[PDB]
RNA sequence: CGCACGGAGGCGAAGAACCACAGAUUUCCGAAUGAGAAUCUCUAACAAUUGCUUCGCGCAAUGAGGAACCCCGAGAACUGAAACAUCUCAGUAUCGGGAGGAACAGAAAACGCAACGUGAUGUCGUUAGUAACCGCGAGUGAACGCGAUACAGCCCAAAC
RNA sequence: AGCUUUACUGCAGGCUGUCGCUGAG
């Protein structure tokens, strides 16, 4: 496929969320990424 | 055209025209279809001209029948703006009526006798 | 109002293009054109840009590599912030 | 003494005779020829205009609107129908032809807004209408004793609200007693049954 | 912190341009050391520069320039 | 120094945080309006429809949204009638158009406890499941009046 | 529920008369 700069942004941003909580947020709340995504096992939109 | 029923001469116009315009300066004109409708209604009218290019023509369809029953003399102008602009008027008028000339009753006079000729 | 340049992007890849090319390399805004990068750089660190290649990255900004003349030294310049 | 509008009103009392008979056979010839709405510098007939509202001033238009003649173009049933709902020629619309007209005007000029309409004839197969819409934005309307009540909000769109003549008269709000029980003071209160 | 708004209303508006000329290279000059991974930061002016940024831009607006 | 109790660091007596009011900034798509486009792009823009008009987009209007309410149009069927067609469900569901903070109505070509009487209009209570409708089946179903609430009455067309 | 037909009842559509558009001798 052929993606455009706005698909790109987007796919670029999905990636990025798909970080995981930073070890200090642990610490900090005293104690998941409710959002992790698997390129195989789930489907972004468009 | 409805209520047109004859062709009036651009000379005999012209001569009309002019008898109007010393008819305000000396004697009285009524400007306007309402006003020019009263006064052939009430008598004092001696000379009542009426626009051909009258759009809708209700607004003066009645002048002609309304003029022969009447005995209430009257002559057509090719130009609303330029009865108007005779009248004295900044604006066009649809009718007028010379209530009473002023040294231009010899004309009118005349004027009303050349039309009933051209019948 | 957006800025042209956004920051020095220093990675491994980077430096090499430092140190053997004489390029520098930027994140950049991605409304920014290889001309308006060229000029911006110019006027930020006082150099003559010879050449700019520009990326799209799926970081979401876009990447600039600045070729400098040779009358610069793109370490020179790199090492000075 | 008679006015002269007086004369233009009697001349459409009976736009079948006289000279008014041989106006309409020649300009429905036009007519015909222009589009669905077009906006005409006078009113065809001014008495009846000046009557409704109607004032030689800016911000005052005019405009005649043709709609055909008959019932609803309706489609026939797609679905299942019990009999008395299977019909397609005899049923007609609620709105008369007058406020379908009006509707029409108001939409081609949405910056106006519908004062009245009256009826110029018709022809075998369709029906014109002159509707007069006011520029409720213009201040030569808006410092207007007489008209300066239709700039208001809430007169906004008032032709497709049914607050215009012709559609509190379709309305069935025309009677004060007998008759009026459902109409009053709105078909919809009243469940739609007027 | 540093500075203050006082300080900002009495530069002259060409003192304002030339000190948000300076407070942008500092910003830039910090976001590259930190892109370089950088630790010599001071995570409080990078903060900072931000803000003056915002305040004489304000300025700049509220005197007409 | 948000939720959020980390680390580093910073801000605050130049009175910060925080709260109220007012102002500044406010990317792109979006009614979306220069043109095109899955939020981007291409070469000055009220696109489109209108009013006024210095007839020049010069001055203006419309567009879309909103929990439901409100007004104007289009308008079923299951169902009930122990079947079913009129009837009923119901002018309901749903659809089209549109306004406001509320809408709509409204100063009698009224009422008609018929009177030597009432006196704009909504609405509430009642009148009453009365009158009226109806395979006179099932079902459907007001009004005048009265007691209340709140009260307010005016402007044109024409004559001259 | 789908289907059929000289089942019951209706609805489109076609044919035809009439009125309007529609006038002169
Ligand atoms: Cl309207
Ligand atoms: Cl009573
Ligand atoms: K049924
Ligand atoms: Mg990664
Ligand atoms: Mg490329
Ligand atoms: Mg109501
Ligand atoms: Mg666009
Ligand atoms: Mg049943
Ligand atoms: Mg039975
Ligand atoms: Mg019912
Ligand atoms: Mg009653
Ligand atoms: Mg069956
Ligand atoms: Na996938
Ligand atoms: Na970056
Ligand atoms: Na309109
Ligand atoms: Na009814
Ligand atoms: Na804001
Ligand atoms: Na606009
Ligand atoms: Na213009
Ligand atoms: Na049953
Ligand atoms: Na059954
Ligand atoms: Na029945
Ligand atoms: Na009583
Ligand atoms: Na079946
Ligand atoms: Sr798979
Ligand atoms: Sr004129
Ligand atoms: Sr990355
Ligand atoms: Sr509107
Ligand atoms: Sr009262």
């Given at each position: 496929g052929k993606k455009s700069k706005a698909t790109k942004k987007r796919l670029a941003k999905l990636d990025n969320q798909n970080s995981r909580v930073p070890a200090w947020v642990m610490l900090k709340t005293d104690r998941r990424n409710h959002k992790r995504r698997h390129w195989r096992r789930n489907d972004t939109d468009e | 055209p409805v209520y047109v029923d004859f062709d009036v001469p651009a000379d005999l116009e012209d001569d009309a025209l002019e008898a109007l315009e010393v008819a305000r300066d000396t004697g009285a004109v009524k400007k306007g279809t309402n006003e020019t409708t009263k006064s052939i209604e009430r008598g004092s009218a001696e000379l009542v001209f009426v626009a051909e290019?009258?759009?809708?023509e209700e607004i003066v369809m009645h002048i002609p029948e309304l003029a022969d029953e009447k005995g209430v003399p009257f002559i057509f102008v090719e130009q609303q703006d330029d009865l108007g602009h005779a009248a004295g008027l900044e604006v066009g008028s649809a009718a007028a009526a010379v209530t009473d000339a002023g040294e231009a009753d010899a004309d009118v006079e005349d004027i009303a006798d050349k039309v009933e000729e051209l019948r | 109002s957006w800025d042209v340049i956004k920051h020095p992007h220093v990675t491994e890849k980077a430096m090499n293009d430092m140190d053997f090319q004489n390029k520098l390399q930027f994140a950049v805004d991605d409304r920014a054109s290889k001309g308006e990068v060229a000029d911006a750089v110019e006027e930020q660190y006082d150099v003559t840009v010879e050449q700019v290649n520009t990326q799209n990255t799926m970081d979401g900004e876009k990447k600039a590599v600045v070729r400098l003349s040779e009358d610069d030294d793109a370490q020179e310049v790199a090492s000075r912030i | 003494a008679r006015s002269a509008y007086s004369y233009i009103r009697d001349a459409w009392e009976?736009?079948?005779?006289?000279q008014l008979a041989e106006l309409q056979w020649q300009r429905q010839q036009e007519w015909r020829n222009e589009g669905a709405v077009e906006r005409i510098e006078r009113p065809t007939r001014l008495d009846k205009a000046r009557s409704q509202?109607?004032?030689?001033?800016?911000?005052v238009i005019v405009a005649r609107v043709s709609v055909r003649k008959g019932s609803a173009r309706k489609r026939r049933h797609k679905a299942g129908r019990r009999s008395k709902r299977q019909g397609v020629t005899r049923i007609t619309r609620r709105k008369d032809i007058q406020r379908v007209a009006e509707e029409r005007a108001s939409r081609t000029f949405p910056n106006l807004r519908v004062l009245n309409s009256y009826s110029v004839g018709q022809d075998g197969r369709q029906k014109w209408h002159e509707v007069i819409l006011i520029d409720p934005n213009h201040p030569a309307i808006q410092n207007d004793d007489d008209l300066s009540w239709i700039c208001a909000d809430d007169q906004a769109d008032r032709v497709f609200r049914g607050l215009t003549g012709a559609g509190r008269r379709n309305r069935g709000l025309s009677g004060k007693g007998k008759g009026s029980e459902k109409t009053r003071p709105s078909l919809r209160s009243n469940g739609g049954k007027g | 912190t540093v500075l203050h708004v006082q300080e900002i209303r009495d530069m002259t508006p060409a003192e304002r341009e030339a000190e948000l000329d300076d407070l942008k290279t500092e910003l830039l000059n910090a976001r590259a050391v930190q892109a370089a991974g950088g630790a010599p930061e001071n995570p409080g002016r990078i903060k900072e520069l931000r803000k003056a940024i915002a305040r004489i831009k304000t300025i700049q607006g509220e005197e007409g320039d």
């Open positions: - | 290019d009258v759009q809708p | - | 009976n736009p079948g005779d006289g509202g109607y004032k030689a001033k800016q911000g | -």
